[PDB]
Amino acid sequence: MKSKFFAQNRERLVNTLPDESITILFAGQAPHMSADAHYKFVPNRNFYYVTGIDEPNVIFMLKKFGNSVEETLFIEKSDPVMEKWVGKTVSNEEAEKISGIKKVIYLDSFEKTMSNIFFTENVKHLYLDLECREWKGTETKTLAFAKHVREQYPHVTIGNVYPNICELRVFKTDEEIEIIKEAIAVTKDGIYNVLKHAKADMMEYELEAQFDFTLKSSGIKHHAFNTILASGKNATVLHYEDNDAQIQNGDLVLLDLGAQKDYYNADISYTFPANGTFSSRQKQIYNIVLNALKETTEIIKPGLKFAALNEHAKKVLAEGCKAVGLIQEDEELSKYYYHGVSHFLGLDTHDVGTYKDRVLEEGMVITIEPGLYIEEESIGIRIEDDILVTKDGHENLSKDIIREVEEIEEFMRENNVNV
Amino acid sequence: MKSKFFAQNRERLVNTLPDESITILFAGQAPHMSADAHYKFVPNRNFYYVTGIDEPNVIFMLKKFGNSVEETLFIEKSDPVMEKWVGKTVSNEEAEKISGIKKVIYLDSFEKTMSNIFFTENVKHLYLDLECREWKGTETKTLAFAKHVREQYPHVTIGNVYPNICELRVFKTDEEIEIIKEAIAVTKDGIYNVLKHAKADMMEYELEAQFDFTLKSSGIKHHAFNTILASGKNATVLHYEDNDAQIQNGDLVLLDLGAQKDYYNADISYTFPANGTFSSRQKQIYNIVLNALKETTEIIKPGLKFAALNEHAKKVLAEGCKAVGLIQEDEELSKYYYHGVSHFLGLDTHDVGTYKDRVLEEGMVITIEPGLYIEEESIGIRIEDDILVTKDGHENLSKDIIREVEEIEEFMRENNVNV
Amino acid sequence: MKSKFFAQNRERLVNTLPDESITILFAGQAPHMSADAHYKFVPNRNFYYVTGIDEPNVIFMLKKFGNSVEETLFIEKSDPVMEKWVGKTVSNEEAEKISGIKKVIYLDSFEKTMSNIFFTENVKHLYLDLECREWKGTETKTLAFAKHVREQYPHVTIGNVYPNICELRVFKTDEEIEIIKEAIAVTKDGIYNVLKHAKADMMEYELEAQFDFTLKSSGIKHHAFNTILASGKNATVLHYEDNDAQIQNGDLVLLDLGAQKDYYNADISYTFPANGTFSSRQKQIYNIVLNALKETTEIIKPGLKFAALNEHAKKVLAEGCKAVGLIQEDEELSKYYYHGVSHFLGLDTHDVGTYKDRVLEEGMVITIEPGLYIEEESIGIRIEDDILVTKDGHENLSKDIIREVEEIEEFMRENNVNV
Amino acid sequence: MKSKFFAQNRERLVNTLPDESITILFAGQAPHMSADAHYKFVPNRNFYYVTGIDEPNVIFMLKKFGNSVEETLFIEKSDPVMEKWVGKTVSNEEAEKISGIKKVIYLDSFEKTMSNIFFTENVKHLYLDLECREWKGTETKTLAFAKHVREQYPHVTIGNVYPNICELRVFKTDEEIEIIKEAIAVTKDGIYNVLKHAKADMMEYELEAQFDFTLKSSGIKHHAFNTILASGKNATVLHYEDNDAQIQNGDLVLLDLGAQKDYYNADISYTFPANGTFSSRQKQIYNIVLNALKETTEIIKPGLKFAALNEHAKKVLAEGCKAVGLIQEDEELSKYYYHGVSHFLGLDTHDVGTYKDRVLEEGMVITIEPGLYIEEESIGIRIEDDILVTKDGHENLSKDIIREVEEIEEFMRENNVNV
Ligand SMILES: [Mn+2]
Ligand SMILES: [Mn+2]
Ligand SMILES: [Mn+2]
Ligand SMILES: [Mn+2]
Ligand SMILES: [Mn+2]
Ligand SMILES: [Mn+2]
Ligand SMILES: [Mn+2]
Ligand SMILES: [Mn+2]
């Protein structure tokens, strides 16, 4: 991932913003976890998308005046003492090389800069990234910053740049797609490794261990999200994360997981039989889902209404359910299939972007993940691919992952130590 | 960990609080990570220590009036929709069973309870757990709550119960020490597994993968802290976490890691030769550090001033450094050893409790971690044990971990595939 | 009053609001009175006019997006315990039937809806009913709400819908006029009852009781405002409410009062001799006022500047005063007549709507209430009618109430038990 | 009520407050009702009890320093314009005469007095009347005042004087009791008036009108609380206020109402048969309730725990219910009797004062109000007397009200036009 990518993102962002306005983005800090410990730092995707900087506590500013456009970074100064504890923070020159932003100055001059901007330069329009997902959320640095601006500069108009950046993230470039592909690749390897080691009478976490191992030893530092490794009746809980039950012989195992490469996410659901063999009933239910996957993936092309995806998924899932006698009428389905089939994928696993009235266009990456959940039969199945919308159709980024009942049983037979 | 342990914690806590006072503790929730994702929930250690409840969103209350003492829990009501996404939350009866608290009610009655406590019952003294580590920190649910109490009940005196509970956590019971013991035990297995798989020309993270595997397969859901796996020059950064450099032949490998069992933490530092053989120079520096370990461990017993540990450590390290020729005078040491030698250990890896004027006493668990860091030689060494203070001395909780140069070289010969 | 009425109110309201905006109205709750008691709940007239709902604590919401328009109500869930104290609150179905609003959901989902509205749907323009009559007023739930919106969604623009709804309330429909007519009708009955029971040497409140009785026994739950029942010198205080003096023989009695029907208000002032016979002097002053009432009512018609009413009232009052000898020049009138002659009438007694530059138009209901107040003679007289502005003139909604000196003396002779 | 009464109230209050402290009480103002209308002003009882001033917008201040004690009143200055609308506000001399407070100054000097108090005199301890009954209540003038003091004078300790005054109000003097007696007297007259006019096939409000009439024409300006006039099944809803149903022949009618004299409250519940005859079944239930009344009133005397009243009430209601076969065991009572039997009475209807661990003492006025409510039989009966606790027993303040079934049937036969 090279500076040119980020520079172009800024060009595009610039074109969405009014003239005579300033925009500020904050890298953020890792939140407190417990005692003196903090959580692992997670780069703010919008900030990162715009600056290419993956470190805390940097600040980015974009001034738009007349025909001019001025971008600036504020980084930390070096601290010889802290370097013996945590290593060196990004340097002036590194920051410029990475971000492609020419003007890189220090945080200690941010306050004075604020003073000039809002007084000397009579700026009237400020944009911040105002992501606020909860009505009763608690105050964040950003919101606090907005409150401050409101009090010192009550005449300044505040706008939200969040939506502006999200709508750009919706359309992936080729190098973005390449990284996702790599993430998927490693996820496949992880899954295959699970398939090669799975057996009955084995703890769910013993299997999770194998997936984690494959990712870790290939250099992947993070997962896309928390691994779902659910066997038997547990696969009925959508985001089951306990992963601490014993896998019974005859149990189906649902995997929902993904590696993360350079801050891009893969997202795969995969269901297989623990003992290497699908039961007659499991084979039925699995193929109904798998149909819904193929059918739904099929209709993907520019011009299609996003809402059509789940509509079709529900149609196909209902036909399969009837055929098999699980239900009589379409309405009963919500008892066995109670989520949406698709979501954007990118810098975030449930990537950003509006869905309302969304129409599919070239460049979008979305997931397709139909599933069926039968509590009384202790069967949970979900199968999920990551699809790229192309110029005149789609490309299945995760097609290399074998999905057919025959292919799975065969693979576990050749490769699984204890089958 | 059985409810009697938490009931007793509450009994001791009660004795530290004034009469005519109410205390409230909050379980909290997982902080925002990115987009719709949150971090993994980490039980608030104080809240956990007092209630034994490891779920979010619960509230605890302790009324102390006259001769009375009334404990209450507020839990979430069940939600048939969310149960299909995340599973059931603790039930009315389970909470009672776990915490030993008799009166358990629901959150939707918390507000009305507030109104009565502060109006009808004329309560004037409220205690909150006010952990505030940063002067320019951002507002938290608790601080917000205090603010609200200040505005609605200005006459109510607010006190901080944080210090009360930390001082209790300083003294571990037998059942506490048993869990720490288990945590160390797995850590050991982890380390051994690293020792048996290590070789030259191998990625740091490849070795981390092996440690992670051992823990995960044994059911351990979390680490104590972010594993440090630093080779050659990298061992010189105290909290080096990149774990993404190649291990050179002749390199030394510094491990600083620990498993966590039922929320209690192990914390071990271990240093070994990648190729299974210490070089002369390395053997020297190692033993110097080893000595400091045994020496400083030696003097541990109730009555000893905490400050004394680091004094002795510095003294013994300096002597080793002189004899070897690394330094001339004691003052130069700080160039090669620039941290404390000890810290409390417990529900937090850097456990709670004041250090100022601290004297050791039966019941404390602490670490001893002398090290030497020689930048110009690309040598970093740290050796760390978890010591328990007994009634007339100490007990080294991690004595089973082999430390001698001979023991290590011998072990890697017998067990390491590629030596 | 049927749902079509309110439905049309909302259609009109919609046409005054910009596109891409949301509007929220709160029913409110009764204010604290003393100890655990609250005042009688008074439906917020704007909220009522829009929803047709007379209960507390409901919330109304109107989204205007693209060509779409979505109306939603939030109501209280039923509570089997409270139903034993206060009775059932409006039900899901009743609310729909009354308001004509199809979507009716519960308050416990209001917060989540807020989150979605202001995050997911990127709403930028919010309208609230911001009636704020006092510069140093105290914070209200609505202002507290705006403050919250401002802190969480600093980019959101806040508009005031109060003016929008008031201007709609200014033009009454036929159904509205009818209700006003009913309210006036009862007021008449109440007045006649007073006339038939009045005598000298009687407590002002004794007469009040007779008027209250007529209204209550006729089903009327509330008065328009606080009954004014002023005898002798007391009629000189414009809003005299004590109502606790003894009516002297020879005293005139000024009645200012009005029944309220279905939340619409009547408003009538009526003066008469306690002993059933006007004195010469009283006949003079009464006729001066009655002249102003007729003359000022006479000029009412679409096109007329509202400011003209009081100009003419003054003119005519001064004419009567000159003729009788009370004053020499027009300027002296302010000593005897010191209020406006007219105000709007409707869901509020001093109904809403601007007066600056106002021109009369069909549909408006206004009052005409000239008076004279002569302190040194202990005479205070006011006669007030409720006028409807019609297509080409006016209609006196209270013409049935007899006003002539001879008509009153005669009525009291025939009907007053002690004359 | 003469000034000496309020003067003694302040003397007692003074003895409950620490030395070196200042106390401020606010008269308040009438809250906004609708548009330009405000609710009727209701003197804040604590303020009233301390000052004897029933006007709004006054401020009272008590300085306690060394051996000194300085009381001050701040009143409004006269406004010649407003006097023509609302009348004269309390004058400098009237204020002194009414309150017994010697130093009376004007509001326009309140602010400067605040400065001197909190700067020049170094006052550290401030008491306010901090009644706050709702955890999520809205900011009040007093809370805003507190907040202000907190911002300008952060060192100043704020205490709540509410409890202090409430405990004084709990013990009534002889002149207080007299007034309550008067309120009760009128209430009785009003009830009898209702008995004399009640018949079947008559609107509930038609009866309420009769009760209001008696009160109004006797000079009573306010009701204790909202008249409850519940017939048939409606008597089942404890605070039924609609009062708009038709009384069916055979219906029992439940009155719960009370006159207010000079701010003191009566509170009576009276049940009778609409047609003048108790049915067998009604006679049964009525007598059970009336027993509970006599029995519970009986045990009242200094030394008796307040909690005993309800315990005995339940005990005696159960016996009656068993005897009649309405229930089998005591537990079933909650189905038909679901409230407390007693509450303090005074300047408030549910008068102030703590109940927890309360022991009855001479001077206390409390109500006794057993009831039975049978939904399936459409029968709701409550009977309530106001009791005074005397030196060695109790005095029934409302004994003159006839309660026996024969007494009532007789009274209605004698006096009721239509029986
Ligand atoms: Mn997934
Ligand atoms: Mn997914
Ligand atoms: Mn360590
Ligand atoms: Mn350590
Ligand atoms: Mn009027
Ligand atoms: Mn008027
Ligand atoms: Mn009552
Ligand atoms: Mn009562």
From TrEMBL, chains A, B, C, D:
It holds the Pfam family AMP_N. It catalyses: Release of any N-terminal amino acid, including proline, that is linked to proline, even from a dipeptide or tripeptide. Its cofactor is Mn(2+). Residues 1-137 form the Aminopeptidase P N-terminal domain. One of its GO terms (biological process) is proteolysis. It comes from the Bacteria. It is an enzyme of class 3 (hydrolase). Belongs to the peptidase M24B family. This is Xaa-Pro aminopeptidase. It comes from Bacillus anthracis. The lineage of its organism: Bacteria, Bacillati, Bacillota, Bacilli, Bacillales.
